[PDB]
Amino acid sequence: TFDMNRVIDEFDEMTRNAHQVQKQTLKEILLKNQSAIYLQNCGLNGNATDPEEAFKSMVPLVTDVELEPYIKRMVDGDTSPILTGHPVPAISLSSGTSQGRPKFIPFTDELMENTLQLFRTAFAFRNRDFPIDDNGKALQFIFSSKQYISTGGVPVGTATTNVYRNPNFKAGMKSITSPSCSPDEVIFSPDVHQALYCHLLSGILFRDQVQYVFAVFAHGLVHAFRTFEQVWEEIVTDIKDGVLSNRITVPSVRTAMSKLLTPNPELAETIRTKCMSLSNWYGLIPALFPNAKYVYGIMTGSMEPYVPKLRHYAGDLPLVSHDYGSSEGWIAANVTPRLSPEEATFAVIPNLGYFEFLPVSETGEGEEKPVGLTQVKIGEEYEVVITNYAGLYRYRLGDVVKVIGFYNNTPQLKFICRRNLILSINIDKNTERDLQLSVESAAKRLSEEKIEVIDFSSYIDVSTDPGHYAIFWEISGETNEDVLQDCCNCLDRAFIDAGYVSSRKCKTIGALELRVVAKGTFRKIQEHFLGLGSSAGQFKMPRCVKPSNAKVLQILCENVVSSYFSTAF
Amino acid sequence: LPILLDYWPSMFGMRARVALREKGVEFEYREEDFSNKSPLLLQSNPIHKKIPVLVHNGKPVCESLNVVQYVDEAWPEKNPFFPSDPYGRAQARFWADFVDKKFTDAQFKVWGKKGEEQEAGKKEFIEAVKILESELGDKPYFGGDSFGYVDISLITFSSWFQAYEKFGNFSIESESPKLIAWAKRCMEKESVSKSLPDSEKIVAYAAEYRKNNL
Amino acid sequence: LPILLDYWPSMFGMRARVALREKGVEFEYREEDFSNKSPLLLQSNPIHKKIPVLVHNGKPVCESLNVVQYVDEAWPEKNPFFPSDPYGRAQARFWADFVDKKFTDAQFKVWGKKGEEQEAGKKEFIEAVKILESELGDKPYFGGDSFGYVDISLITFSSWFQAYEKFGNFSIESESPKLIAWAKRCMEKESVSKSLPDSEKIVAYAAEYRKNNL
Ligand SMILES: Nc1ncnc2c1ncn2[C@@H]1O[C@H](COP(=O)(O)OP(=O)(O)OP(=O)(O)O)[C@@H](O)[C@H]1O
Ligand SMILES: N[C@@H](CCC(=O)N[C@@H](CS)C(=O)NCC(=O)O)C(=O)O
Ligand SMILES: N[C@@H](CCC(=O)N[C@@H](CS)C(=O)NCC(=O)O)C(=O)O
Ligand SMILES: CC/C=C\C[C@H]1C(=O)CC[C@@H]1CC(=O)O
Numbered sequence: 001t002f003d004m005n006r007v008i009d010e011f012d013e014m015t016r017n018a019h020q021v022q023k024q025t026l027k028e029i030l031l032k033n034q035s036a037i038y039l040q041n042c043g044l045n046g047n048a049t050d051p052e053e054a055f056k057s058m059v060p061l062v063t064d065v066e067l068e069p070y071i072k073r074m075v076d077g078d079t080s081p082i083l084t085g086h087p088v089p090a091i092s093l094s095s096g097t098s099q100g101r102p103k104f105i106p107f108t109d110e111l112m113e114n115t116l117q118l119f120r121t122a123f124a125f126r127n128r129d130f131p132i133d134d135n136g137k138a139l140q141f142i143f144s145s146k147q148y149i150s151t152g153g154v155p156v157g158t159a160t161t162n163v164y165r166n167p168n169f170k171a172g173m174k175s176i177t178s179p180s181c182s183p184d185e186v187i188f189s190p191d192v193h194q195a196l197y198c199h200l201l202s203g204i205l206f207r208d209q210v211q212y213v214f215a216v217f218a219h220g221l222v223h224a225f226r227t228f229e230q231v232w233e234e235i236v237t238d239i240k241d242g243v244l245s246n247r248i249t250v251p252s253v254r255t256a257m258s259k260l261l262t263p264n265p266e267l268a269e270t271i272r273t274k275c276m277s278l279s280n281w282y283g284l285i286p287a288l289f290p291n292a293k294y295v296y297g298i299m300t301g302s303m304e305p306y307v308p309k310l311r312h313y314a315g316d317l318p319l320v321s322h323d324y325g326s327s328e329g330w331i332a333a334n335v336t337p338r339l340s341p342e343e344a345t346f347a348v349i350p351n352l353g354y355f356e357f358l359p360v361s362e363t364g365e366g367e368e369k370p371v372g373l374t375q376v377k378i379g380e381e382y383e384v385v386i387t388n389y390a391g392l393y394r395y396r397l398g399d400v401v402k403v404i405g406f407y408n409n410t411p412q413l414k415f416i417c418r419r420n421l422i423l424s425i426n427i428d429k430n431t432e433r434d435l436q437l438s439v440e441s442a443a444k445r446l447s448e449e450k451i452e453v454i455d456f457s458s459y460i461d462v463s464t465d466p467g468h469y470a471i472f473w474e475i476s477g478e479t480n481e482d483v484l485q486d487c488c489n490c491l492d493r494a495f496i497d498a499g500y501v502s503s504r505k506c507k508t509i510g511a512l513e514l515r516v517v518a519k520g521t522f523r524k525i526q527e528h529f530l531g532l533g534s535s536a537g538q539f540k541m542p543r544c545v546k547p548s549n550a551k552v553l554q555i556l557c558e559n560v561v562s563s564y565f566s567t568a569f
Numbered sequence: 570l571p572i573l574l575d576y577w578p579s580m581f582g583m584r585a586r587v588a589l590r591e592k593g594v595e596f597e598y599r600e601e602d603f604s605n606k607s608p609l610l611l612q613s614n615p616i617h618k619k620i621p622v623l624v625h626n627g628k629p630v631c632e633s634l635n636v637v638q639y640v641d642e643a644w645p646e647k648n649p650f651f652p653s654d655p656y657g658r659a660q661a662r663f664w665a666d667f668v669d670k671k672f673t674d675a676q677f678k679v680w681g682k683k684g685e686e687q688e689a690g691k692k693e694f695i696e697a698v699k700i701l702e703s704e705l706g707d708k709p710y711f712g713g714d715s716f717g718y719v720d721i722s723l724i725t726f727s728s729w730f731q732a733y734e735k736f737g738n739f740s741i742e743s744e745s746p747k748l749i750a751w752a753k754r755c756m757e758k759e760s761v762s763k764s765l766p767d768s769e770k771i772v773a774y775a776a777e778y779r780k781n782n783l
Numbered sequence: 784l785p786i787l788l789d790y791w792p793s794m795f796g797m798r799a800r801v802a803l804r805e806k807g808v809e810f811e812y813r814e815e816d817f818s819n820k821s822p823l824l825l826q827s828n829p830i831h832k833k834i835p836v837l838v839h840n841g842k843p844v845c846e847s848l849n850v851v852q853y854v855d856e857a858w859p860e861k862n863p864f865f866p867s868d869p870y871g872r873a874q875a876r877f878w879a880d881f882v883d884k885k886f887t888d889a890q891f892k893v894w895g896k897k898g899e900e901q902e903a904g905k906k907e908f909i910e911a912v913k914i915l916e917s918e919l920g921d922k923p924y925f926g927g928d929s930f931g932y933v934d935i936s937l938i939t940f941s942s943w944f945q946a947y948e949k950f951g952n953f954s955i956e957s958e959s960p961k962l963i964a965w966a967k968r969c970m971e972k973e974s975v976s977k978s979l980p981d982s983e984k985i986v987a988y989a990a991e992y993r994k995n996n997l
């Protein structure tokens with residue numbers, strides 16, 4: 001039951017306990033999972049009285065590539081438990097690439113506990129600084145509207161979707177947020193760019209009680225507000241005559257919007273007045289709900305570029321930096337959320353998992369053995385090595401963070417990063433350039449409709465016969481179906497190399513199926529990756545999915561705003 | 570500089586813009602109010618008063634398929650549209666002339682006329698796109714191994730394809746996919762990717778015509 | 784030797800005949816039966832089944848203007864048809880387009896129509912004959928310092944000049960002596976003194992068509 005002072009005391013207690021509970025985190029990760037075949041190669045049985053030493057001396061580090069095949073055995077027909085154990089309820093993808101390729105990572109309900117607790121606690125300290133109303137609501141640009149089942153018949157999953165469509169998300173977050181402005185069905189709507197539109201709409205609805213605007217990322221916010229600049233007059237028109245715009249097509253979300261609407265002319269006057277009264281839309285956020293204590297989201301690392309345009313958006317309002325963790329292992333909390341984005345830092349909460357760091361101290365890089373999290377040095381730059389409940393054990397996530405200080409007994413962390421970038425030689429690509437080329441080439445058909453293509457991804461299906469390619473796009477707008485068929489036809493037609501030509505001209509590999517997905521889809525990908533526990537070197541996107549990439553994939557199937565197989569071929 | 574006298578809904582006008590941008594000449598566009606044809610236009614073509622018109626060295630070059638020939642010949646050193654053989658050149662003028670007859674007129678019927686008139690040009694355009702799709706057969710394009718002459722000729726028609734599928738209440742892709750297919754393929758070139766208006770507005774211009782004559 | 788698939792009263796066919804004979808090329812002339820079209824005409828043109836078409840090198844070239852341009856482009860050594868500058872060739876082209884449509888519409892309306900149509904068509908032909916007469920400034924040919932491209936496209940109407948005189952109650956000579964006599968200069972050319980069939984046969988044919996369709 002969420003309170004402010006008791007949890008923080010337990011958390012001060014906890015954070016000072018950082019060693020006992022880091023060590024106990026390790027006990028628990030292997031006591032629950034003594035059974036890993038990975039560890040049998042290592043020769044592990046648990047207990048003992050050199051347990052931490054036996055772990056840091058007998059298990060080798062592992063990389064995305066060596067980690068690909070085992071969790072790959074989990075997901076595809078063999079429903080088999082492996083590196084951690086349990087045939088998990090969801091699986092991951094990872095920013096950067098596993099030799100250009102896919103990286104799988106297991107999800108367990110434990111990680112959901114980790115979620116809630118980080119979020120009761122992070123919210124405690126924030127409302128301790130940025131206090132809210134308990135009868136109000138929030139502008140949260142959060143989506144999780146997509147949910148597939150892997151080719152193995154097992155679900156596999158993104159952070160956000162695995163959070164929000166989870167059974168305990170709704171009961172557990174009820175006391176730690178201000179009630180979400182949008183129906184769950186439009187949060188979970190098959191058309192999410194339209195839902196983004198009905199998310200502005202929704203967050204704009206109960207604006208008076210809203211205590212903050214939320215995206216995980218400033219670019220999430222910045223795309224929400226530049227989008228607002230595009231469509232505000234239309235939004236007036238939507239809610240105005242009690243008739244949602246013809247732009248809206250998907251039935252359930254349409255029934256939900258009509259479930260809220262009647263003809264109401266009075267408020268257009270007001271909104272038109274304020275909206276045309278501003279200077280190129282500076283301070284639009286306090287302009288919207290003027291009683292927000294904050295704008296929230298991550299504000300360090302590769303999004304620092306997005307603080308200004310969003311600062312232009314946020315006006316004078318305080319930008320609070322969001323904490324730092326993920327499915328692959330959550331890392332830290334900002335228990336002093338009042339600090340500026342430029343100085344913002346996130347303190348490591350100790351039952352997250354079992355983390356060691358690889359110090360860069362020497363030159364670049366330097367051949368040093370790991371030291372514990374409180375054996376780490378202040379001001380120095382180390383790369384995060386991860387052990388948790390999510391398929392990861394002393395793993396190299398490959399990304400660099402600085403210690404700026406200590407919140408009592410736990411070290412505080414700074415992200416000056418962007419990319420875990422070096423790659424290697426691929427095979428999902430169909431040339432990446434081709435993939436992107438294919439996106440672009442087909443896209444301008446959409447661009448006829450005054451839009452540009454904001455993002456794109458893809459996947460290969462060997463469940464089917466013939467196995468087929470799946471293209472996913474993110475755009476700024478909705479459009480009728482004919483062009484989308486024309487569009488799928490061109491992704492089929494835009495891979496310039498002789499090979500692709502051979503396969504689908506004969507028909508041994510399937511025609512390409514373009515499932516165009518919605519807005520924020522890849523923002524989800526960015527937003528769940530940079531905050532992901534390790535260091536901002538996470539920004540990315542792998543552009544094509546072997547069976548062994550998963551996170552992008554939870555976000556892939558359900559929101560077929562349109563999914564079309566080529567009527568060509 | 571080359572001055573173009575164009576009109577935003579002109580598939581023809583677009584043939585010239587695409588033609589000019591394809592080769593790689595920087596040029597200025599001028600928007601025609603055909604209610605008020607401008608003094609340099611009525612001095613370019615005093616009787617037709619038709620566009621696109623390209624003024625080079627104080628000389629007006631008019632008729633669109635002519636203008637793209639002119640585009641070719643004006644700068645003969647980089648991107649040719651014809652192949653080196655005379656016959657393939659003859660092919661590309663032939664099929665360009667195919668584009669200019671039943672095909673143009675059928676589409677004119679389909680977004681311009683209704684009823685008894687409508688279904689004729691409705692069966693005309695599919696037959697047109699069907700011979701079209703046969704003759705495309707394999708080539709990424711039409712009048713060369715690369716972006717050719719008539720590639721420019723009918724690519725500018727692919728922004729009206731929305732207006733056709735809507736008034737026509739059709740879907741010209743299931744009957745013949747590979748064409749509209751090749752069209753958005755061709756859209757990647759900045760010759761047509763910057764030289765063609767938004768299709769929804771085209772749809773709105775057809776809509777204006779449609780509401781005006783009923 | 785190049786095979787020509789042709790129609791004896793066809794003005795476009797005469798254009799082709801005139802191109803090849805002016806060239807010094809040696810070809811085999813073939814008449815078509817549009818009732819019962821020959822296998823090459825159907826195996827050369829799957830679409831419009833029209834004439835003229837010349838097969839050469841094992842390659843079919845159709846349309847009169849497109850053939851003439853193939854005539855010029857395959858044999859550019861003795862009698863080039865176009866000027867060297869692309870602009871003169873430019874003028875030649877859109878003027879070839881003018882004779883091709885506005886003038887051929889107008890003349891067809893003269894020999895192929897009646898009543899009001901016959902009357903508006905006369906007005907257009909005498910105006911169209913005036914603007915052609917205007918273009919020449921008053922020059923002897925149209926496409927070169929010698930026999931040119933637009934002469935070729937326009938000479939074959941000189942066989943039917945008599946047909947427009949006769950059906951249309953109009954003298955093209957007393958109103959524009961220069962165009963008919965332009966044609967009559969071109970008549971000392973075997974290109975026109977062998978390719979354009981007698982005026983008697985064609986006036987009789989226009990009348991023969993006159994009998995068949997109402
Ligand atoms: N930073 C974070 N953002 C969102 N969810 C997180 C985060 N960290 C941990 N989680 C939690 O991880 C659990 C679900 O994410 P999840 O573990 O399912 O995906 P996964 O299959 O491991 O892989 P991934 O998120 O990388 O796609 C959740 O219950 C969720 O709350
Ligand atoms: N063959 C010409 C056809 C051009 C044509 O007919 N253009 C019309 C566009 S509908 C025009 O310019 N009309 C002028 C007007 O409507 O006033 C070309 O392709 O340039
Ligand atoms: N562009 C063609 C059109 C020619 C045309 O209509 N030709 C007539 C010959 S008089 C024809 O082939 N008509 C076929 C028919 O009667 O349908 C050309 O100029 O040759
Ligand atoms: C641990 C809580 C998981 C959900 C967190 C998600 C949000 O609600 C904002 C992003 C955040 C991800 C993050 O903190 O790493």
Ligand SMILES: [Mg+2]
Nearest residue numbers: 157158550551
């Ligand atoms: Mg996932």
